[PDB]
Design a binder for this molecule. Structure first.
Ligand SMILES: Nc1nc2c(ncn2[C@H]2C[C@H](O)[C@@H](COP(=O)(O)OP(=O)(O)OP(=O)(O)O)O2)c(=O)[nH]1
Ligand SMILES: Nc1nc2c(ncn2[C@H]2C[C@H](O)[C@@H](COP(=O)(O)OP(=O)(O)OP(=O)(O)O)O2)c(=O)[nH]1
Ligand SMILES: [Mg+2]
Ligand SMILES: [Mg+2]
Ligand SMILES: [Mg+2]
Ligand SMILES: [Mg+2]
Ligand SMILES: [Mg+2]
Ligand SMILES: [Mg+2]
Lengths: 431, 431
């Protein structure tokens, strides 16, 4: 039921907010814009670590583009939905801008829990507990708590950052429940690991300490259970599909364009792989009148994004009933007519950009930096009577369980930028 | 007349676009988001040069906050305007979201022409032509062209960046005429210098090479002339007042908060100067329950921004007829009840932040960097037969008049970030 999916509740509320008596979905955008975690995204790795103030993307600019594309997708889907179910507007009072606001707010914050150095950073944080110092804690934690530690993802960290309670400020940013539902793409815990081939089962979305919180949200939105066991799991919110589609479109096209502009990909491929996407709307005279690679690739990027957005809207509207029922098992991008072109673009990006020498060098350095910082924090946690551990506490982190302390350490390491992490690493070693 | 101020025309159009047959004001936001000049704002100075990846603001985050505040102001003012003039909605078909879109798009791009190192950078570029090498060109240029060169501001550079014609792409970003009108705050040329004490006469808004372009815009929007001479000048677009109010509110409050968080201002002042702004809505229990300086200053900042936004809307609605007629001479912030508090905050910021030792060091370095780069470009321009000048052209800038070439050099220097400028300066000197 769509009347329960578009909820306006906030954490710690007793009177039900109504749409007629209102806007809730724009304050979420404003609150995310003005927060420190969002501001820390300006110097976090998207693909190339330590961007050197070049023209390449960071996490912040990527999130902004995903937000624009998500607003467009949400507006179109909301128009079609309001056409399909008239009573959503004539009784409850929902307009087609609310869907755009929800998807834009969710897409702006979709990537906020990521640590420095990107995917390699998450792998390093996991390997620290798996085959490093943190291994010593394995006997002192529940299997669900250990699987949280050794398979750390930014998806759970983002939910925690968004919904963190502190003395005097309950609920953290206190976003609406619809935004939280559209933000979550893996509504399950860390065990069991990969129970099936469903798209919503690749990873997990919340930690144990936050688990209870999500239950509340999942009760309010009327999500559909899938547990059939002692481990909880729910079905996806329908707008989470749109969030994922926007994320995928943006990074797939922009990575290719950035690689072309950097000199790692020849310009010819730009027309070898993209023409079928842009052939139906390209103006040949305008394309031929341009005189630099940047203009041509920008033109192609704009046309491709438009085409993919339209196709995604059509695909979503086709399989709406299955998504509402919970039986859909793929993403909207896998039901597309240009899957071969996307696959070729991704494979070329993997061969040329992800495995380039400079990228590998930066990832190797990031492994060492993260391991050193985590080991210092953990050793200061174990013994708190020495002078050195007091100094470490004063520099890095100015009544809890062991699991809560370890989660706090992981969270505090992941709020740093690449530059701050490198500077702290050099300071620890006195260089 | 408001029907002519909200124009949807784009550069190179022959058929008049109508509001009923439509959205135009959102494509402007999307186009600015995806452009390279907007992306270069992530590493440009707001107050503290070479931010060192800290929590302090850059140009990009400042522009985002100004955009949010501008959207709020525009929505409120548009609601009241549509209440005052019913025919704006029942015949033409304008909704209260269009004003918000126009003000948000104008506020997002309000600061895009700024050079590296902020105000000191503009002063250095001017001093280069005034008392440096570029002085040699004084005899070869018209007085209006020389006053453009020696009083370079980012306001004219931003208009040029927004409306730059290139082979195969006429009109640059091709934004709507309403957005261009709301973006311009000084609709006049560089001579005469400060003819009066009007707020719209402190600086100039367009260069000579772009002058003709603005005339077209000023013809379409029905702006009111003020020349009475051979030098053209027009009255302000009414929404430019809202853009300026949002810019002022944001930087005035956030500079204070950032100085407090950095350790340059004691926390006590935070309540000595802000209470009258926040005393009517502050919750004392919530304020006392917080346990860190960051939370308290963030709470105070939010409350102050809300109060100032409401007061600005009231002030604008009071003096609407004078603004439409063109007789208003001050900003909306000078007709406020909290002018003494704002003045005290600004004076404290000047004493403590602008004149701190680190800031002065960075500005002094930026002077040398900009002078070196400009001199190299100009010398390569003068003689183009030497091997060294060919190398300089190949490194820095891979049929025009002298004035056009000098303007192009100034523009190409101002597109660089602080890091890129420093790296190029070191490369020129071989360090
Ligand atoms: N350097 C590097 N970048 C990678 C690698 N794998 C992926 N990336 C980049 C490509 C994209 O810019 C970005 C994708 O991350 P996102 O968090 O946006 O989504 P992703 O689909 O990877 O995962 P998620 O939805 O979070 O489970 O990461 C890799 O092995 N190395
Ligand atoms: N470091 C430093 N920063 C300054 C100085 N004067 C102003 N600022 C900073 C304070 C604000 O963050 C920012 C204001 O620049 P904006 O371009 O936003 O507007 P402003 O009113 O200065 O001028 P405009 O409207 O462009 O004529 O510049 C100065 O002397 N030194
Ligand atoms: Mg992600
Ligand atoms: Mg993904
Ligand atoms: Mg992403
Ligand atoms: Mg400015
Ligand atoms: Mg100003
Ligand atoms: Mg500004």
């Amino acid at each position: 039921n769509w009347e329960h999916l578009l909820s306006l509740k906030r954490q710690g509320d007793t009177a039900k907010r109504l749409r007629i008596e209102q806007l809730g979905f724009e304050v979420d955008y404003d609150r995310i814009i003005f927060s420190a975690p969002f501001r820390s995204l300006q110097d976090k790795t998207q693909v190339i670590p330590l961007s050197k103030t070049d023209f390449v993307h960071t996490r912040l600019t990527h999130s902004l583009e995903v937000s624009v594309v998500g607003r467009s997708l949400g507006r179109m889907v909301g128009k079609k939905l309001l056409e399909k179910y008239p009573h959503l507007e004539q009784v409850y009072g929902y307009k087609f801008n609310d869907f755009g606001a929800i998807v834009a707010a969710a897409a702006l914050a979709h990537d906020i829990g990521n640590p420095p150095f990107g995917a390699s950073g998450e792998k390093a944080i996991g390997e620290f507990f798996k085959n490093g110092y943190g291994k010593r804690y394995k006997d002192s934690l529940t299997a669900k708590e250990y699987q949280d530690l050794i398979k750390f993802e930014g998806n759970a960290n983002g939910f925690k950052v968004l919904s963190q309670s502190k003395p005097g400020a309950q609920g953290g940013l206190r976003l609406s429940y619809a935004t939280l539902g559209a933000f979550m793409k893996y509504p399950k815990e860390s065990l069991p690991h990969k129970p099936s081939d469903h798209i919503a089962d690749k990873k997990y979305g919340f930690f144990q300490s936050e688990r209870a919180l999500f239950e509340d949200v999942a009760q309010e939105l009327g999500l559909l259970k899938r547990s059939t066991t002692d481990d909880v799991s729910w079905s996806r919110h329908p707008l989470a599909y749109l969030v994922e589609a926007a994320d995928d479109i943006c990074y797939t096209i922009i990575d290719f364009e950035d690689g072309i502009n950097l000199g790692l990909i020849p310009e010819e491929y730009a027309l070898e792989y993209m023409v079928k996407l842009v052939g139906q709307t390209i103006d040949r005279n305008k394309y031929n009148a341009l005189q630099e690679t940047s203009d041509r690739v920008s033109y192609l990027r704009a046309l491709a994004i438009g085409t993919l957005i339209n196709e995604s809207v059509d695909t979503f509207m086709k399989y709406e009933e299955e998504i509402l029922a919970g039986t859909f098992d793929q993403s909207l991008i896998d039901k597309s007519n240009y899957q071969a072109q996307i696959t070729d673009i991704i494979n070329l990006s993997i061969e040329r950009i992800y495995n380039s020498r400079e990228v590998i060098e930066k990832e190797i350095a990031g492994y060492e930096i993260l391991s050193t910082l985590l080991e210092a924090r953990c050793r200061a946690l174990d013994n708190n009577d020495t002078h050195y551990n007091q100094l470490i506490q004063q520099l890095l982190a100015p009544e809890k369980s062991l699991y809560e302390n370890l989660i706090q350490i992981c969270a505090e390491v992941s709020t740093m930028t690449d530059g701050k992490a490198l500077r702290n690493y050099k300071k620890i070693k006195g260089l």
